Amino acid sequence: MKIVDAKVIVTCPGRNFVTLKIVTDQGIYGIGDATLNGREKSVVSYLEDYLIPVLIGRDPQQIEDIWQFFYRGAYWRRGPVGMTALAAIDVALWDIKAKLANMPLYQLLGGKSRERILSYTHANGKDLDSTLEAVRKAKDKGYKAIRVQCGIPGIDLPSVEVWSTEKYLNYIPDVFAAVRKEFGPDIHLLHDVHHRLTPIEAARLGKALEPYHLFWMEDAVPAENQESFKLIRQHTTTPLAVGEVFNSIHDCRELIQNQWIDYIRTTIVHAGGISQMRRIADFASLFHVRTGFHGATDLSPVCMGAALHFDYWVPNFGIQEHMAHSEQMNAVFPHAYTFNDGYFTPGEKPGHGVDIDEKLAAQYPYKRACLPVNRLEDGTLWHW
Amino acid sequence: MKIVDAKVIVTCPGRNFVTLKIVTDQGIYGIGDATLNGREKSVVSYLEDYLIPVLIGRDPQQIEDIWQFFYRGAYWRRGPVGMTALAAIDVALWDIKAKLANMPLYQLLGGKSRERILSYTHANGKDLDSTLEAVRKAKDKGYKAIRVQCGIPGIDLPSVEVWSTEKYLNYIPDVFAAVRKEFGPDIHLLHDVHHRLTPIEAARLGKALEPYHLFWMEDAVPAENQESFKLIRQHTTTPLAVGEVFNSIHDCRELIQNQWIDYIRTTIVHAGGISQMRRIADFASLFHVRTGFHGATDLSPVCMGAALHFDYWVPNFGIQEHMAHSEQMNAVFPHAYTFNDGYFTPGEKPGHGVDIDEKLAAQYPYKRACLPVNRLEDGTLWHW
Amino acid sequence: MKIVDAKVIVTCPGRNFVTLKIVTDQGIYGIGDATLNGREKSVVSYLEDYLIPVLIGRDPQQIEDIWQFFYRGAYWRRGPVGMTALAAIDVALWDIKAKLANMPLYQLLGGKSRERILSYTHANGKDLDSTLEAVRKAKDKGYKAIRVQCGIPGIDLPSVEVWSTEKYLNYIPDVFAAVRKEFGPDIHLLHDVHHRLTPIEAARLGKALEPYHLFWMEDAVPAENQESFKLIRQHTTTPLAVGEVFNSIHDCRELIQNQWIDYIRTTIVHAGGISQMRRIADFASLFHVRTGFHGATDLSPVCMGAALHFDYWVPNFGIQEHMAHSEQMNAVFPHAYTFNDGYFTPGEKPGHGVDIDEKLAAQYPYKRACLPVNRLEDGTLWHW
Amino acid sequence: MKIVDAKVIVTCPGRNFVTLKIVTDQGIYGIGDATLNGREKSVVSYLEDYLIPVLIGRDPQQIEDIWQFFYRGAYWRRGPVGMTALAAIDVALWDIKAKLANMPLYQLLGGKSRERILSYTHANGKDLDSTLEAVRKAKDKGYKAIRVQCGIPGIDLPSVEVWSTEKYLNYIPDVFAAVRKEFGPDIHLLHDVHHRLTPIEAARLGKALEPYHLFWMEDAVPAENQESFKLIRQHTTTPLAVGEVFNSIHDCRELIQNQWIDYIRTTIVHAGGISQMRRIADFASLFHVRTGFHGATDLSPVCMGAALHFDYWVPNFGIQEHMAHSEQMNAVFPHAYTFNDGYFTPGEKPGHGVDIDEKLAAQYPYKRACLPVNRLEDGTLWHW
Ligand SMILES: [Cl-]
Ligand SMILES: [Cl-]
Ligand SMILES: [Mg+2]
Ligand SMILES: [Mg+2]
Ligand SMILES: [Mg+2]
Ligand SMILES: [Mg+2]
């Protein structure tokens, strides 16, 4: 068996998505997500100008050899751009392998471990009354788990947000108190701190949120120095999640082996595909850590299909984020996965069950969109 | 899909082997090794009286769910008997899954990572001259790696050996000096200490063996207290291997994460099958540890086939032990794996490529054989 | 002195019990429990097919030599099946040694350290009102210590239970609040978490239970990774117990030496007998850990007699679990130990004071019964 | 002051170089290296499609604010592609700031700390005789420090090398013995292991090289798991260097703070520019670590000029690698730095003293060239 062609498709049906398609000499093809929000074209070049020319002629069944060849062979290791490119290749090859086996991908990984996959959605409001309404709307859509974000009183190219830590820490516990009073204890509640605190501030916030029994408090502090979480863990029993921005097991080995976190959020598209995320999830399982894949709209339906197959098998599954794609996004990527009453199943189609409609994708050209930056009230460039 | 039957076959074509066969409602079947040397019938009962009745009617594609069901569901966790029974089930189910995919098993794991699999053999002699001759005979059979064991001057139910640590430590370095003088530096040399030393004795021996640059020094001290290896590692750069007797990742997590060993020897048949050994090997890979599967004759050809498929894929492969089965053993277990000039390939037959000839197996009834014990010169019951 | 015979008796007077009887050439005999709930026949084979043939002709007075011979000589070390078989031998030999000395067993261990042995019983209800009634019934039977378990609102082969961690954590503290309000502070209250939490969940629960001053919170998290308890210990002063499922000191050395637990629950029948439990209890004593032997109905009266003799001597005794055997069970195993007003004494008969009525045991053939498994609400196979 | 334009120039005068030029509204401009060997065009896109559009209109004097804006604002942090793009911006802005100050760049950093900057060159041979000749040729060019690499007996798209660790470890100490015998003890000798060993192999090699007193042994093991170096450091006093492949302080914080290495090799072009390398070098200085910047031909003369200015100031300077550019490369990048008798000075021109001749650069179009991969003798994809 040989790879005869590989191509990168770029489309913007509401937001930018980048997709790799690998075609074999037997006409079976596979696809993988390569989208890196706000830096998309750097991955397109990494693939087109460097990795795709090496793929041609190789045996697509050698998933591990090709993963190692690109991971080690880049010489400069890890990193968002190269690991997203490698993820796209790895997912497309697992898609091919499952189609050659005539099995849905979850069967190749070890089969199903559960009948349904818990998800969570968003509830965002500019103030408390609107936040409470957004939680009602999320519950009415059948979600059993809801991430709550609320505006704080007094608070093509990157937008610039302004931030006050002190105002946020003083107000946000009152939001969770009000949500618990209105909606009761059974609903799972999540909160994303979005990198804005120092560890002793995160320790304070985790303690203040303990009475509300959150499913997790996410991304509390920037995590390049993984020891940052030791101080948080010493002060609170609010569960901790981190890692949507990671691209390697080396970004989280210490967080996990020291039991400093409860959920690892690192994704298939951003951390080298199914081959690497199997290793992260298995390492996590030794230390009570569960998967909580990031699932914002900037991960394409191809990533979602691969993630749901992974979620259906992995023993230490925690939850799957679901920020829904629009109708126009979904039409470009026909898929077998489905949602019902707060939960997903991956679908029984062979492969990860996702395809790309190339004719439709071609109707929507790339349009640049970058992520915001965040400044403190004095103008300091902070963490967004 | 359903399991319709499962049975345990016991045969003694020169030594005892126990094999599980699982049969599906589509007539595809899979087999797994269940042999536990010197306690064989305890596994037969564990399977026949407890696990097989639960398997019937289950979907064999759910490998992970069934692994967890038995691993956790036994309540009393881990252990040689239960983990060998679970290994037999797990291997038979991966054999079925690969046959359903119409692929050799290594393809399901991620594909081949190498063209050939390095093995090692034995060279044993009662004295130095005979040891040197045994090394020549091993080299003439095409082996590139040879385990050297030599008798020490002055040294149905279990045989009782006698042991002197001091005589062994004084003599064994001279054996490796003589082997290097006769055979040169290119041949890989291994030594199995077989549990007989304390850590400071193993540190001394490792230092004394450094000039001879061994591939490994194996099982230097009993390893129930994994911190025993820290003191060895602080004193020698001879590479260290351990773990043929282990049955769980929990027997070696600290040895590996602290970089106290170089090779993990734990096997598919004795540690819960391919599902658990994938997790051990991947954990090992984060810490520079390589696989060195045990491969004595008491692991059946079914274990060897599964091991060779695993070895063909796993990135951090080190070596495969090969103590050859006899012609009568091989005839009971037709297999696709082959040996050439010191190396193996697993074969391209779907599954792990091994089968059992039930009619032939029935010609050789069980015959008890137990492992020796070892006593010190004063009669103390020691480690064999 | 020589062992002339040894036999395994299997009986099901309401539930399965396995018993070893060793007979000496002077006609003195000893018995030991060999019951391993839900895997019973695997121990029968381990004994009959491997260990008993080695016992014959040996001097029964050599308890330590025989313990080492089997512990080390199995080659594959530790584990539920082999350690239960070895426990049966070790207890039967201590029973013989005490009969040869013409002493109750506790005298051989070092004599009595207390006049009475505190026990605890069960109080289980499907809801809070019924739980409160079960606590009244337990108190009326004279118990001074009561384990409380309550159903949670909204929650031959293994039964399958369903589990929600979040519902349990939200409700269970209210059960202990109600029990304290009704029964006051003097009664000792225990709770068994039964392996269902992660460490930060157990930390949360321990904190929530602090106002109710439990004697212990038991088996909070699966303990194969012993470092799991470090995080619990950093967050709560509720006392911690673990270890009914352990079979070796190596399962708990780190829990004890780091002062991560308060009570070790590992038993004579499941962890290699009196010889090994003397070593566990003495190690525990250096680190303030007290014995809290498991004492569910699946440990036979032979185990109970040995445990009570051990409990009467050991300095760092904490408590003895007592889930009562039925009248039919007790009739098969005449014994000297007695209960009075919440406490036991072991009895003054030589040996451990327990015997087996072989004629009566023969009236009740083995009947398979396995332990349940537990699944999460999505179907994930969890810890029961 | 404002940035009015910024552009990326790509040229291949013998090998590919990528250069950023930032132009201010006062006509002062600055340049920075953006070359990432073997992935060059991914950086071109990162700059052109994402970062340059944000630069336009910003005040170039705000070097720190712009560094933080891009480092944090990318959201996905660190990594070879983004950190090389950010390095190009940071160096071009320091070039502008020094030109506005009318000072050579080293004056802005704190002034000169030394009169001359020690460098090292290459001596490579296919065998020992040729290696010895290459060392003579290097000495005759005035170098006082020489990296020695020798072939080992029996050993557009990526070339595939083959590797044997055992043959290398057996032979390489003899090469250093011969070099010391011929050239004496005063010459500084370096060796690059190039990622090929495990830590205990590197410990062995470091010990074997101790009699030859190397300046350093470099890149002994892949360093994603920084604790890998602890075991090397416990066994040898050969000095250790690592880090040409790093892009962040987070790749080396533990190596440095634990005193596991002697020289940090991370470069201005690959790790976020002068702003980040000032922080790495200062952190290193607290722990006795000295700078040893990588200086292979794939770092352009723009990187060399910035590095030499940095080297002239930094207190804890160790050495500068110098693998010489060709005449055609040098003509595209006129520069003030000069070499004399083994040492450099950075030159007294304002800025880093390097410029790009755009007309000449335009004569040499991009031509793809990728780095080799390395396979073991069995075909395993290894570290190159
Ligand atoms: Cl990158
Ligand atoms: Cl066992
Ligand atoms: Mg987030
Ligand atoms: Mg061995
Ligand atoms: Mg319990
Ligand atoms: Mg180098």
Curated annotation (Swiss-Prot), chains A, B, C, D:
InterPro entries: D-mannonate_dehydratase-like, D-mannonate_dehydratase_GalD, DgoD-like, Enolase-like_C_sf, Enolase-like_N, Enolase_C-like, Mandel_Rmase/mucon_lact_enz_CS, Mandelate_racemase_C. Substrate binds at N37, H122, E244, R265, H294, D298, E321. The active site is at H194 (proton donor/acceptor). Transmembrane segments: none annotated. It comes from the Bacteria. It holds the Pfam family MR_MLE_N. Its cofactor is Mg(2+). Keywords: Lyase, Magnesium, Metal-binding. GO terms for biological process: amino acid catabolic process; carbohydrate catabolic process. Disulfide bonds: none annotated. The keyword Lyase applies. GO terms for molecular function: magnesium ion binding; mannonate dehydratase activity. Binds 1 Mg(2+) ion per subunit. The keyword Metal-binding applies. Its EC number is 4.2.1.-, 4.2.1.8. NCBIfam families: ManoateDhtManD, PRK15072.1. Belongs to the mandelate racemase/muconate lactonizing enzyme family. GalD subfamily. This is D-galactonate dehydratase family member RspA. It comes from Cellvibrio japonicus (strain Ueda107) (Pseudomonas fluorescens subsp. cellulosa). The lineage of its organism: Bacteria, Pseudomonadati, Pseudomonadota, Gammaproteobacteria, Cellvibrionales.
